[PDB]
Amino acid sequence: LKAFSKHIYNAYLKNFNMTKKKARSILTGKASHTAPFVIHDIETLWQAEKGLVWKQLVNGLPPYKEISVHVFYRCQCTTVETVRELTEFAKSIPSFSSLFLNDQVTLLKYGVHEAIFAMLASIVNKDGLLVANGSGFVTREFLRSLRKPFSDIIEPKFEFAVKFNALELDDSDLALFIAAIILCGDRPGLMNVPRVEAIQDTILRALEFHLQANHPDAQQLFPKLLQKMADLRQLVTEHAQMMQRIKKTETETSLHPLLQEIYKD
């Protein structure tokens, strides 16, 4: 069961560009590494959009862009990229790839944002989060200063993150936690529910034993992670409701087609 756990952890190490270990060494928890440029206002954002590069979007901010919309587009680039990694992470686990492709799409459709938000914590601290593969740090206050639609879709994520990082989980813990969120036999339209439930239960029993070893002193941690999965469920529900309002009221902001395929139902 722990051999199954190491296989999930390696799938994680091979498919994710940023790990909590590496993220923690950047904002300096103890083992400092290197640099992060701070974007805390329009001037520094402009400087980042030149200095730490990025190249791909970065279009004007008057006729149909503006500081707040440009930041939202950046959020989209980031979420679509993490979706690609999550997909390769899932495909790297045998049981997941054995399922018929339609079931794989259904699982990813309803669980990728729950995983994204769980992972967001790894690169978040009370004051901000890293961007551009760790090369930058965007302050929490700056994000809050954005127009009222875009400035409040990210704030609740910080509140989750802070409370989530208090559990002090490591990458090996996260590998299993994310796998558990993706292999959820409770998703709408799942064709083979029994098979999925079976894979999930197995992931959850390996997670439980893994904590037993990894966190021998933490009490009620496993059931606590279970409540978090439930909280993540509600966080995504609120997130989608907010994405709904932006689509209805923010006529100039474009929406990535892939992210459009996820929320549609």
Swiss-Prot record:
Tissue note: Ubiquitous with maximal levels in placenta and skeletal muscle.
Subcellular location, record wording: Nucleus
GO cellular component, one term: nucleus
Keyword Transcription regulation: yes
GO biological process: adipose tissue development; apoptotic process; apoptotic signaling pathway; axon ensheathment; cell differentiation; cell population proliferation; cell-substrate adhesion; cellular response to hypoxia
Keywords, comma-separated and alphabetical: Activator, DNA-binding, Metal-binding, Nucleus, Receptor, Transcription, Transcription regulation, Ubl conjugation, Zinc, Zinc-finger
GO MF term set: DNA binding; DNA-binding transcription factor activity; DNA-binding transcription factor activity, RNA polymerase II-specific; DNA-binding transcription repressor activity, RNA polymerase II-specific; linoleic acid binding; lipid binding; NF-kappaB binding; nuclear receptor activity
Processing and modification events after translation: 'Lys-48'-linked polyubiquitinated; leading to proteasomal degradation. Deubiquitinated and stabilized by OTUD3.
Domain NR LBD residue range list: 37-265
Main location: nucleus
The keyword Chloroplast is assigned to this record: no
Oligomeric and partner information: Heterodimer with the retinoid X receptor. Interacts (via domain NR LBD) with CRY1 and CRY2 in a ligand-dependent manner.
Role summary: Ligand-activated transcription factor key mediator of energy metabolism in adipose tissues. Receptor that binds peroxisome proliferators such as hypolipidemic drugs and fatty acids. Has a preference for poly-unsaturated fatty acids, such as gamma-linoleic acid and eicosapentanoic acid. Once activated by a ligand, the receptor binds to promoter elements of target genes. Regulates the peroxisomal beta-oxidation pathway of fatty acids. Functions as transcription activator for the acyl-CoA oxidase gene. Decreases expression of NPC1L1 once activated by a ligand.
Family: Belongs to the nuclear hormone receptor family. NR1 subfamily.
The protein, known as: Peroxisome proliferator-activated receptor delta
Source organism per UniProt: Homo sapiens
